């Protein structure tokens, strides 16, 4: 499922991401744009057996378990398959675990390189939420 920017924004606000650990809603929408281009089924194999899954490209070596990654920690205690869903709950819940403090969005290189420092609010202005 590929979301529209406002539809995604609304679902994210609805799941507690607005101002979570001090991060304005714009940051989360901008991260998804650059990580999975709003696609819930985006995947991406890295040289290392690790594979990033879903709308927020969550890693299989540390956060979810795809059962094919050598030395998985599975810190979100979830199978990587669930992160590939139209419903973003599982993805949001794991992202919440990952962002433990006000610098935790650095967990997404795309956000650090393409969103941080820019007008991330632009992604939500004109959206109904």
């Amino acid at each position, epitope marked *: 499922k590929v979301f529209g920017r406002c539809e995604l924004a609304a679902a994210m606000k609805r799941h507690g991401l607005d101002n979570y650990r001090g991060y304005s809603l714009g940051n989360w929408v901008c991260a998804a744009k650059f990580e999975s281009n709003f696609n819930t089924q985006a995947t991406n194999r890295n040289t290392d057996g690790s594979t990033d899954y879903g709308i927020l490209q969550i890693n299989s070596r540390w956060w979810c378990n795809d059962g094919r990654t050598p030395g998985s920690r599975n810190l979100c205690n979830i199978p990587c398959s669930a992160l590939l869903s139209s419903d973003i709950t599982a993805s949001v819940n794991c992202a919440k675990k990952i962002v433990s403090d006000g610098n935790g969005m650095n967990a997404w290189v795309a956000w650090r390189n393409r969103c941080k*420092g820019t*007008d991330v609010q632009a992604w939500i*202005r004109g959206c109904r939420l």
Partner: antibody
Amino acid sequence: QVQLQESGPGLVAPSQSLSITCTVSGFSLTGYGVNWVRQPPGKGLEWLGMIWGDGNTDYNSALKSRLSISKDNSKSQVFLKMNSLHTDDTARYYCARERDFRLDYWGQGTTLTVSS
Amino acid sequence: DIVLTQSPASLSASVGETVTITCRASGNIHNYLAWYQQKQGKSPQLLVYYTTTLADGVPSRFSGSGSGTQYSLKINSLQPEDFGSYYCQHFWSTPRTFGGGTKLEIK
């Protein structure tokens, strides 16, 4: 730790242009915006404009045409240039760091007086 | 531009009192509102961002509220170090503007 400091000319005539510098340390100019704000003697705060981490700029509507903001990421400096100086421009000028829609760290400010 | 109407211009109070400062926006700012405190001869300092969030190190006696167009800063049990000026500022698009300020002084 995060620090911002302004430097400016102090006194300027209308026939002169104005440049104030904001040197920062403790963070990268690519990851944060820097806003310019002024406070005339005994008055309230006035927003002048800003420069995003990406280099884009936005200005105060009424002053846009007299203002120019630029930065040098390598020198860790941001500049505010003003022309067509009025006496109403006399004020304390500040640069502040913007982190995700809030000015979290401010410089001490520099005082400017617009003479005859 | 979205203009902010802050009131009152001045307020006299005693230590221990609870006061309220208000900021009304000419248009919906969607909670993108911050409050600063400025002490005599110092730079403004951040207190509250995104309407209700306290900056680090700010005591819980300060609390923010609001939605849409009306916003308030409540100070519970004023302390000697709370006196000075207070400003609200919005961050909805650009240009940004500040409220006119409120001088909080000793009764």
